[PDB]
Amino acid sequence: KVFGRCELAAAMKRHGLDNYRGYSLGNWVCAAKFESNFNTQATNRNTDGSTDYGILQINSRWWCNDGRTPGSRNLCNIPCSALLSSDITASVNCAKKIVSDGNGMNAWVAWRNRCKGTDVQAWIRGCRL
């Protein structure tokens, strides 16, 4: 599925991301925009044997199990396939786990590079929430 920004904002809010651990909703929408262009199927296969999965491009070394990645920790306790669902349940819960394990949003390279320090509220402006 390719989300729209406001549709994604509303789904992320229903899953509790608005101000989760100090990150206002626009941060999460901005991260998704630049990680995957809102595509739940986005899959980026790296040369270290890991892969980044789904709308938030969560990586298979620490976070989800794909059975092909060296050093696997599976800290979200999910198959990476769950991160490719059209419904964002697994991706949101795993994003929460990343932060609950002491990582900022700085875990998402696209957030660091496209979102941190900008007017991220613009990503939810004019959305029904």
From Swiss-Prot:
According to its UniProt record, where is this protein located? Secreted
Q: Which cysteines are joined by disulfide bonds?
A: 6-127, 30-115, 64-80, 76-94
What does the record give as EC number?
3.2.1.17
A Gene Ontology molecular function term for this protein is:
lysozyme activity
* C-type lysozyme domain mapped to chain residues: 1-129
GO cellular component terms listed in the entry, alphabetical order: cytoplasm; endoplasmic reticulum; extracellular space
Catalytic residues in the record: 35, 52
Q: Which PROSITE patterns match?
A: GLYCOSYL_HYDROL_F22_1 (PS00128), GLYCOSYL_HYDROL_F22_2 (PS51348)
Q: Which reaction does it catalyse?
A: Hydrolysis of (1->4)-beta-linkages between N-acetylmuramic acid and N-acetyl-D-glucosamine residues in a peptidoglycan and between N-acetyl-D-glucosamine residues in chitodextrins
Q: Mind listing the GO biological process terms from this record?
A: cell wall macromolecule catabolic process; defense response to bacterium; defense response to Gram-negative bacterium; defense response to Gram-positive bacterium; killing of cells of another organism
Quaternary structure (record): Monomer.
Other facts noted in the record for this chain: Lysozyme C is capable of both hydrolysis and transglycosylation; it also shows a slight esterase activity. It acts rapidly on both peptide-substituted and unsubstituted peptidoglycan, and slowly on chitin oligosaccharides.
The family note in this entry says: Belongs to the glycosyl hydrolase 22 family.
Task: Give the protein's function.
Answer: Lysozymes have primarily a bacteriolytic function; those in tissues and body fluids are associated with the monocyte-macrophage system and enhance the activity of immunoagents. Has bacteriolytic activity against M.luteus.
Q: What is this protein called?
A: Lysozyme C
